Design a protein around this ligand. Structure first.
Ligand SMILES: [Mg+2]
Ligand SMILES: [Mg+2]
Ligand SMILES: [Mg+2]
Ligand SMILES: [Mg+2]
Length: 755
């Protein structure tokens, strides 16, 4: 480029910067093309073009001005890239602001979508504020290849679409530009199918929606509603390996954590709205907004010391009682809690407080509601036509046709969407088996095998692998978590290694072993020592997340306290021993709201949590216990640096089944960070119990779950114990400990102590 052109950009004299900024074809070779990407990056000293899907990164060079950059790249197609931008000591990674010079679908957009590879399709499908022919308005576009006609109906035309009939492009996508409307416009698509039947659909790519049970889509000016402040968070995330960090998740259902009064408006970020009543049977209660949740949940979690919040599905869903697992508005956060910018505020505030956000994401099915994706254009469009693979009859829902390009694209781009537009730090997928198996919950003679005669759902495996490949290329540093309940192999291993590409898997076997164990009367736990120890036998086959989830405290299973045998004191003690063991056992941690304060009743999605319990000392003390335990977890490297390496764990002794005692080491990079963990899973205290340790010296009693401030009996080692030179458990030194009842100790060598 010329200095004249550069200067015109620098000084805002250029008539259209899209002519020179962004990606432009310079020439075509025999088997490749030569492209330039240009960027004007005021205050940046350096920049690079990342091609994450090719695993390439090319420096940009300043050209004529220190803040004007160019990068020449040869490759057959330059569809997917990001800019890395360095300003002083800080780097950010963004999409190119000059990527898309028009709001309408280009030939190239249509080609990539038709192949399944348009990773940013949601910039053009749906409803977008823009300008065509010189006039500002909204561009609508919708995939409905078999429809006879489609019209846009909404507030602007009194729900009569005759003068807003769309135009069909390339036999597949309908479009329309409507002048002089903007964000806030309420609309649907009116479709006529090949039989001539006329019906109404919400926008599959809609960014916002009326409050259930209303279903109109609402236009959002999604890039001009919120100013983020989380660049430093995002930079640390991208440059870190979350597998080597503390990850302690507080699982939350946003509709049911805390409710407000329906006698007042719902406050929003700089605004308000009408209250959303929780149910017709509890009409004095309303949901809190994303904004109020940012003001209340976030400092709560921060104070408790969790590293992450995991949300039950916040995608738009018509029925509260599905908990969010039956989604019909995949591209919009639910309007129960306010607007898209209110949820952006929530995430930005989590990041400001050093808390990550993991979203339960639901690609496995969708319900039949007529506003939603079902039978979209008068054919089986999103769902497979064959009910043997396209319906989950036991659930009454429909299964996406994962092999169909535009359906695959809807979902792949959907996952990306939440990381792009809402800056989230991870996803979790529930019931991954539901996708992986062609015979899932199907009787003999009611499913068919794959092309090789197996039960593997080939198209769904390919889709999962593509999601996880892309996610980690575009957003390194994220968490992709699976619950898979059939022992499918290599769930949490890279795709190149034959895995599904998740980085964590819930240890459901561990969860069952633990809860089943602790439910047993302590005298009988001697017959079930194997529940304590078995999960370490397969542990190194996956990267495990130790999750005690919402699913375990509903449907007659009781809340945690109620699972435990004995009198009130011992129920509390069992809870503290179990969770101390969980936090010291190898693997990342997840627990669900209400577990941290000892709610007695089961989780009820229709009400809120029993916060009044926190007026009473025993619930206060258990909440303090969790607060201290999360703090300890973040402060002790041996609890998180080597979760997934042999080095990080070794049993000291696990044979004393008749006393339900086990002990083990955790380690990290510094030998002086090693920890000695001792568990006593009966109420019998032990005044002298010998445990082998690896070094001489004084072992501080770093944590003790029977401490009085946690509700315990305050038994223990009064600070710590000097090791004896007395061989034990095949170790040269040993501690003569007092073991409190129904409790776990963590001890740590203080190599500087005075003898
Ligand atoms: Mg009409
Ligand atoms: Mg399940
Ligand atoms: Mg058993
Ligand atoms: Mg309540």
């Amino acid at each position: 480029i010329s200095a004249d052109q550069v200067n015109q950009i620098i000084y805002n004299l250029h008539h259209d910067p899209f002519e020179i900024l962004g990606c432009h074809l310079l020439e075509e070779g025999k088997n490749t093309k030569k492209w330039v990407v240009r960027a004007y990056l005021p205050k940046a000293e350096a920049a690079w073009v990342i091609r994450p899907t090719e695993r390439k990164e090319d420096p940009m060079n300043s050209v004529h001005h220190p803040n004007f950059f160019e990068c020449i790249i040869e490759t057959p197609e330059l569809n997917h890239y990001q800019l890395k931008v360095k300003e002083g000591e800080h780097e950010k990674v963004i999409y190119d602001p000059y990527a898309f010079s028009s709001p309408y679908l280009t030939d190239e957009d249509i080609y990539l979508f038709s192949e399944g590879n348009h990773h940013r399709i949601y910039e053009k499908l749906g409803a977008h504020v823009g300008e065509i022919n010189g006039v500002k308005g909204v561009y609508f576009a919708v995939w409905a290849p078999n429809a006879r006609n489609v019209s846009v109906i909404g507030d602007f035309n009194n729900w009569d679409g005759r003068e807003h009939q769309m135009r069909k492009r390339n036999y597949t996508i309908w479009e329309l530009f409507v002048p002089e409307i903007g964000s806030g416009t309420v609309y649907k698509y009116e479709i006529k199918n090949s039989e001539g039947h006329i019906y109404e659909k919400s926008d599959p790519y809609g960014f916002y929606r009326e409050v259930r049970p209303n279903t109109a889509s609402i236009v959002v000016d999604i890039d001009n509603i919120y100013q983020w402040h989380d660049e430093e968070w995002l930079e640390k995330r991208r440059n870190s390996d979350p597998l080597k960090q503390p990850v302690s998740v507080y699982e939350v259902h946003l509709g049911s954590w805390l409710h407000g009064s329906s006698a007042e408006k719902m406050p929003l970020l700089n605004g308000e709205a009408d209250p959303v009543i929780v149910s017709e049977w509890n009409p004095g209660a309303r949901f809190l907004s994303y904004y109020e949740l940012a003001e209340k949940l976030i400092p709560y979690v921060k104070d408790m010391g969790y590293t992450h919040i995991e949300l039950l599905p916040i995608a738009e869903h018509p029925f509260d009682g599905s908990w969010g697992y039956q989604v019909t508005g995949f591209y919009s956060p639910t309007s129960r809690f306010g607007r898209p910018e209110d949820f952006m505020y929530f995430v930005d505030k989590c990041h400001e407080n050093g808390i990550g956000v993991i979203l339960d994401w639901v690609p496995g099915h969708f319900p039949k509601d007529s506003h939603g994706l079902a039978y979209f254009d008068g054919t089986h469009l999103y769902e497979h036509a064959d009910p043997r693979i396209g319906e989950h009859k036991e659930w009454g829902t429909l299964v996406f046709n994962y092999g169909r390009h535009e359906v695959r694209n809807f979902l792949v781009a959907n996952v990306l969407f939440w990381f792009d537009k809402y800056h989230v730090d991870g996803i979790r997928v529930d019931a991954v088996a539901s996708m992986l198996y062609r015979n899932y919950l199907r009787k003999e003679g009611e499913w068919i095998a794959n092309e090789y005669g197996g039960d593997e759902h080939i198209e769904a495996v390919s889709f999962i692998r593509e999601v996880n490949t892309l996610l980690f290329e575009y957003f390194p540093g994220i968490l992709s978590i699976a619950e898979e309940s059939t022992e499918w192999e290599k769930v949490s291993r890279p795709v190149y290694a034959g895995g599904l590409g998740f980085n964590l898997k819930w240890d459901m076997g561990w969860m069952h072993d633990m809860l089943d164990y602790f439910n047993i009367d302590p005298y009988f736990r001697q017959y079930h020592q194997n529940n304590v120890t078995f999960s370490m036998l397969y542990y190194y086959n996956e990267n495990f997340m130790l999750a005690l989830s919402h699913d375990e405290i509903v449907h007659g299973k009781s809340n945690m306290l109620g699972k435990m045998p004995g009198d009130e004191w011992q129920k509390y003690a069992n809870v503290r021993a179990l969770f101390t063991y969980m936090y010291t056992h190898p693997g990342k941690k997840t627990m669900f709201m209400s577990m941290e304060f000892g709610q007695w009743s089961e989780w009820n999605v229709w009400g809120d949590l029993e916060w009044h319990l926190l007026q009473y000392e025993p619930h206060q003390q258990l909440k303090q216990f969790f607060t201290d335990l999360n703090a300890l977890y973040q402060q002790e490297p041996a609890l998180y640096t080597h979760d997934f390496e042999y080095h990080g764990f070794e049993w000291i002794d696990c044979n004393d089944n008749t006393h339900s005692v086990v002990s083990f080491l955790r380690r990290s990079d510094d030998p002086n960070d090693s920890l000695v963990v001792v568990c006593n899973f009966t109420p019998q205290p032990h005044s002298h119990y010998r445990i082998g340790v690896p070094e001489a010296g004084y072992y501080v009693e770093l944590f003790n779950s029977d401490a009085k401030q946690y509700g315990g009996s305050n038994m223990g080692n009064l600070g710590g114990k000097w090791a004896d030179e007395w061989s034990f458990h095949n170790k040269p030194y040993s501690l003569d400990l007092c073991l409190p009842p129904l409790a776990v100790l963590i001890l740590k060598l203080d190599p500087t102590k005075v003898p």
